[PDB]
Design a protein around this ligand. Structure first.
Ligand SMILES: CC1(C)CCN(Cc2ccc(C(=O)NC[C@]3(O)CCCN(c4cc(NCc5cccc6nc[nH]c56)ncn4)C3)cc2)CC1
Lengths: 247, 198
């Protein structure tokens, strides 16, 4: 069975036919939830905002700049804008980044950014989008595109000396919905990389325990640098986020 | 000439200027991650193989980056990236941080290809794993629909890779099987004793 030919014949994407898309991944989930800091969040216009005000340095940064390509039929950030962010100034010497890169030029420019900020890419996580509910909805293609683009990439980068697969499969969201799958947070948190976690260009809708969310559209803020730092003061400085709290 | 053709050869040393120009190039290199060093990969004379068309370049690990370097050095812009989701016969899915469910194939463009059927297929392949390092045959169908009837060349292919409209190059092919008269003529002229040395 050639699912590529089938897509040409019927409009059903090949990923529509992936099936199912010990099992002790809990308890670890439970340790993560016990370890999580309270959710913190700050409305900030990241282009005019001195990113150095966000302290302490982070163990994990999730970066979700709003690309124009996300608004097919709908303030967008160019890769020029993104590459000029000073992400290295807020990353801990040993730390990780997850950069949503889209499906076009970001797959190259996102790699330039990682290297510019001092990371090396260690994984390429693909969000595969099914179209089970709308097989008859052709895609308006990028002028440079050779194929219909049915996925987005989230690049994982590491800097310093340091159960899941590199695929997320969900149905393609409705037009004008820019949200990324919440499964990315599960993958990130299951790595047990530390507890200072930053989500840049998050929204009210993405705020999450264990995360500091910073972005221009937040309606409310509760961020206080000294309060945030107090979550990681001794004896809690080096916790992975997957272990018991210290008595 | 339509039926499969191939040349057993060391791709480092073959004079590929005898092969003519191709609408599509595909390569599945033995990245140094019988491999080629990064420099040997950079020095492959890919630029002579096409004037206007597409290149399909399989990559993994740090060749996701090295392959982008080669692509650009050879004169291509990366304009797509196919991923092959690996399944078993029951359509279930089969880098030290995550398990890997996919293989990547970069898509580069050179020049301004005219008359190709862009957007017919999508950029995800769902297909069963076969032997080690055996690429899915679906890619030939996607490529044929993109550019029907044109001449194509595959680098680092194996016997099971030979296909009509394709010339296959690799060092595990059986001999030399050439049917296109223009290629045959230029091959005899360049290699009158049939040997390919240095
Ligand atoms: C799963 C994927 C989609 C598919 C696989 N993919 C990785 C991959 C794995 C295997 C092969 C493969 O098996 N390919 C057939 C060769 O035959 C095997 C041997 C070298 N190879 C060459 C090499 C060469 N020059 C260099 C050289 C070096 C040392 C000694 C030599 N002696 C003669 N040449 C020598 N010239 C021509 N062909 C080609 C290809 C790709 C990942 C994704």
């Amino acid at each position: 069975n050639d699912y590529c030919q089938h897509f040409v014949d019927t409009g059903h994407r090949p990923q529509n036919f992936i099936r199912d898309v010990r099992e002790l991944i809990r308890l670890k989930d439970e340790l993560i939830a016990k370890s999580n800091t309270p959710p913190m969040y700050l409305q900030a216009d990241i282009e005019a905002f001195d990113i150095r005000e966000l302290t302490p340095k982070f163990d994990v940064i999730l970066l979700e700049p709003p690309l124009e390509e996300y608004y097919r039929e709908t303030k967008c950030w160019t890769w020029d804008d993104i590459m000029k962010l000073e992400i290295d100034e807020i990353a801990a010497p040993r730390s990780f980044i997850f950069l949503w890169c889209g499906s076009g030029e970001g797959l190259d420019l996102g790699r330039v950014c990682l290297r510019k900020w001092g990371y090396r890419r260690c994984e390429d996580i693909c969000w595969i989008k099914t179209n089970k509910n709308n097989p008859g909805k052709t895609k308006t293609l990028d002028p440079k595109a050779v194929f219909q683009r049915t996925k987005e990439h989230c690049l994982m980068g590491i800097k310093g000396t340091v159960v899941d697969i590199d695929l997320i499969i969900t149905e393609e969201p409705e037009i004008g919905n820019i949200e990324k799958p919440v499964e990315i947070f599960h993958i990130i948190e299951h790595f047990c990389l530390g507890r200072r976690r930053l989500h840049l260009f998050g929204r009210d809708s993405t705020i999450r325990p264990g995360w500091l969310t910073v972005g221009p559209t937040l309606t409310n803020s509760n961020y206080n640098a000294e309060t945030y730092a107090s979550y990681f003061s001794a004896p809690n400085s080096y916790l992975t986020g997957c272990t018991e709290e210290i008595e | 000439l339509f039926p499969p053709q191939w040349i057993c050869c060391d791709i480092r040393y073959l004079d590929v200027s005898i092969l003519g120009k191709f609408a599509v190039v595909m390569a599945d290199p033995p990245w140094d991650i019988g491999t080629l060093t990064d420099d040997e990969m950079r020095r492959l004379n890919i630029p002579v193989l096409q004037d206007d068309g597409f290149l399909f370049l399989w990559v993994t690990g740090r060749a996701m980056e090295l392959g982008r370097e080669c692509l650009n050095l050879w004169g291509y812009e990366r304009v797509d990236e196919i991923i092959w989701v690996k399944t078993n016969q029951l359509q279930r899915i089969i880098g030290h941080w995550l398990n890997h469910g996919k293989e990547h194939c970069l898509v580069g463009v050179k020049g301004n290809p005219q008359g190709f059927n862009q957007g017919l297929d999508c950029d995800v392949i769902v297909a069963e794993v076969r032997s080690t390092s055996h690429k899915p045959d679906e890619i030939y169908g996607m490529i044929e629909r993109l550019s029907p009837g044109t001449r194509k060349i595959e680098l680092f292919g194996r016997p099971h890779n030979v296909q009509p409209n394709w010339i296959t190059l690799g060092n595990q092919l059986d001999g030399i099987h050439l049917l296109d008269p223009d290629v045959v003529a230029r091959f005899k002229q360049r290699y009158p004793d049939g040997i390919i040395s240095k």
